């Protein structure tokens, strides 16, 4: 891990802030309605696949793209709270003359983010599964070589996985995943060897919605991985029972045979 080598390698400071975003009024309304919808009720009854519901809920929390509502065109920032937070953060950071690395588990949401960054004066470079493979490494190199490109939209599936992105400084994980490893590698794109500048990681999450329950899932997973990779004395994940009640809206507010036998007795005493 990067703790037994940090003093011997001299990486910069890293941060892992989390922001519990608050769902906007229209966003709240669509979410509150869809949880109350008959479809969710049927999924709770197990009549069909749960995946459909989970997709729908994640979409709602991600933007009201279930239903689209001049200056209220599709993918409007003010319509969804997380986009408001992203606006504020990118505003302050662009004023800081700093390079940002914005990740999203989805690909079409990466498009809504793209049109947003058009709506702003933020010069970006987007990179997902549809961008050509041959244009991939040159795109990464381009973004890393010059500071003109400010933000770098990324889908986590190609955005993770071995690319080096030391050019960016600030990383924001816009959308959680069921897989902790996805966001972990995403945030770890920056904080690598050659990152000569401080980097902070912002996880944008919707309080009380599906995304918090997915967060609980990926925490429980992470603890399970820790229990077997870093040390087995992990603390029990006491926060949740992890059931199928994740459809709710609850917004805020030589060993000499005695060493052996001793070791054996130790293990079998537990």
């Amino acid at each position: 891990m990067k703790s037994d080598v940090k003093m011997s390698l001299s990486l910069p400071d890293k941060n892992e802030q989390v922001l519990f975003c608050r769902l906007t009024d229209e966003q709240h309304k669509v979410y509150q309605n869809f949880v109350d919808s008959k479809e969710v009720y049927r999924i709770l009854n197990g009549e069909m696949q749960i995946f459909s519901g989970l997709i729908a809920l994640r979409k709602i929390c991600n933007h009201p793209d279930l239903f689209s509502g001049e200056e209220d065109q599709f993918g409007y920032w003010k319509r969804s709270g997380k986009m408001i937070v992203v606006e504020s953060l990118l505003k302050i950071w662009h004023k800081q003359g700093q390079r940002v690395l914005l990740f999203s588990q989805s690909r079409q949401m990466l498009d809504i983010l793209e049109v947003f960054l058009r709506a702003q004066k933020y010069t970006y470079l987007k990179m997902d599964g549809t961008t050509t493979i041959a244009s991939r490494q040159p795109l990464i190199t381009r973004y890393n070589e010059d500071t003109s490109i400010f933000v770098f939209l990324l889908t986590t599936r190609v955005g993770g996985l071995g690319v080096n992105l030391t050019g960016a400084n600030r990383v924001v994980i816009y959308d959680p995943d069921w897989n902790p490893s996805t966001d972990t590698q995403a945030r770890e794109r920056a904080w690598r060897i050659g990152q000569k500048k401080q980097v902070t990681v912002y996880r944008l999450l919707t309080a009380g919605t599906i995304e918090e329950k997915i967060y609980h899932r990926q925490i429980f997973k992470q603890f399970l991985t820790n229990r077997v990779l870093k040390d087995p004395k992990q603390r029990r994940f006491f926060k949740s029972n992890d059931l199928y009640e994740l459809f709710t809206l609850t917004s805020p507010d030589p060993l000499a045979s005695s060493s052996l036998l001793a070791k054996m007795r130790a293990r079998n005493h537990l």
Partner: protein, 365 residues
């Protein structure tokens, strides 16, 4: 002999000569000692015996009744006649006694303080000799035919376990990890034996008539499959390369670990080069075994000529390893003989048998 004493005394011959030649002469003179007895404690047949590798004083013995008896082989009485008294015993009343036949029992090499025993109750139990309590229990999904700890491993402390499953289980006594399996056999593994020479070489014999030598470190399957003919009948290996024409229910590396002796239910014993598994074509004649389980047989150590002592029905047939000449057949048991174990210090042989007896064979005069 007095020539041998005079030759030792005058330096004509190395003292190694007198030791080895006399050790051999003693082996050829093995005879049922009625001037020595072993205390009867097994209600059922003795499947296994194990004299401890350091100091050769104690013997373990595993019965068909599930009890493990721990004998003292030193004549602590002043008489010339003595019974090898039983020091301890995992008896019918021990909370940890095996539920069914104990099939193998083995001293931990390098130290007498711990031994291991495997049974038909699908368990390999590790015992603290002193307190005589189990320190560990490995459960297998299938009945254990034999296990074996490396006589040489100062580094690893794996137990190879052969069950009726087709897979060889390696149980690490250092932190207990019974997951590792060697795959490649197809029927029950009736015998496993670590090389006495190489730390990580294991030979495993199975009822599918095939014997495989493994490098358990290696992640790529068996090193060698012993083939009776060495290639005269050569086939793309899917069913050929059988060591025997029946089940192979016995393995024993020769003392120096350069050759492998396999006995199978085709009533043959073969001698294999343990390096390339090539058949040395030693004859040995006909060796009657029809044991349906593992057949525990030994070799001699520290003699001018190596011998192998194989249970031959109700007798122990003694053969010269490298020439095949049958020395003799030791006739003193009443039912089939299951196991013989060799005491390397004094050229004594102990053999257990289904008639609930352990007979000592000591050299005459």
């Amino acid at each position: 002999m007095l020539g041998f004493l005079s030759a030792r005394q005058t330096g004509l011959e190395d003292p190694l000569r007198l030791r080895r030649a006399e050790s051999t002469r003693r082996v050829l003179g093995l005879e049922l000692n009625k001037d020595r007895d072993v205390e009867r404690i097994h209600g059922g047949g003795i499947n296994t015996l194990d004299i401890e590798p350091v100091e050769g004083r104690y013997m373990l013995s595993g019965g068909s009744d599930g009890v493990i008896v721990l004998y003292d082989l030193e004549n602590s009485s002043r008489q010339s006649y003595y019974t090898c008294k039983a020091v301890c015993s995992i008896g019918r009343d021990h909370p940890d006694v095996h539920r069914y036949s104990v099939e193998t029992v083995q001293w931990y090499p390098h130290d007498t303080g711990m031994f291991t025993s495997s049974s038909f109750d699908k368990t390999l139990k590790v015992w603290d000799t002193n307190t005589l309590q189990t320190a560990d229990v490995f459960n297998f999904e299938e009945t254990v035919y034999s296990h074996h700890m490396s006589p040489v491993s100062t580094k690893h402390c794996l137990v190879a376990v052969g069950t009726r499953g087709p897979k060889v289980q390696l149980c690490d006594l250092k932190s207990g990890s019974c997951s590792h399996i060697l795959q490649g056999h197809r029927q029950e593994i009736l015998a496993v034996s670590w090389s006495p020479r190489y730390d990580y070489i294991l030979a495993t014999a199975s009822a599918d008539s095939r014997v495989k030598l493994w490098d358990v470190r290696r992640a790529s399957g068996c090193l060698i499959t012993l083939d009776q003919h060495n290639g005269k009948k050569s086939q793309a290996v899917e069913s050929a390369n059988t060591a025997h024409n029946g089940k192979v229910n016995g393995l024993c590396f020769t003392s120096d670990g350069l050759h492998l002796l396999t006995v199978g239910t085709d009533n043959r014993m073969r001698l294999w080069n343990s390096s390339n598994g090539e058949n040395t074509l030693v004859n040995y004649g006909k060796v009657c075994n029809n044991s349906k389980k593992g057949l525990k047989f030994t070799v001699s150590c520290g003699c001018s000529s190596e011998f192998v002592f194989v249970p031959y029905g109700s007798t122990i047939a003694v053969y010269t390893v490298y020439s095949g000449e049958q020395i003799t057949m030791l006739k003193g048991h009443y039912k089939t003989v299951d196991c013989c174990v060799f005491q390397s210090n004094f050229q004594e042989l102990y053999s257990g048998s289904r008639d609930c007896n352990i007979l000592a064979w000591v050299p005459s005069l």
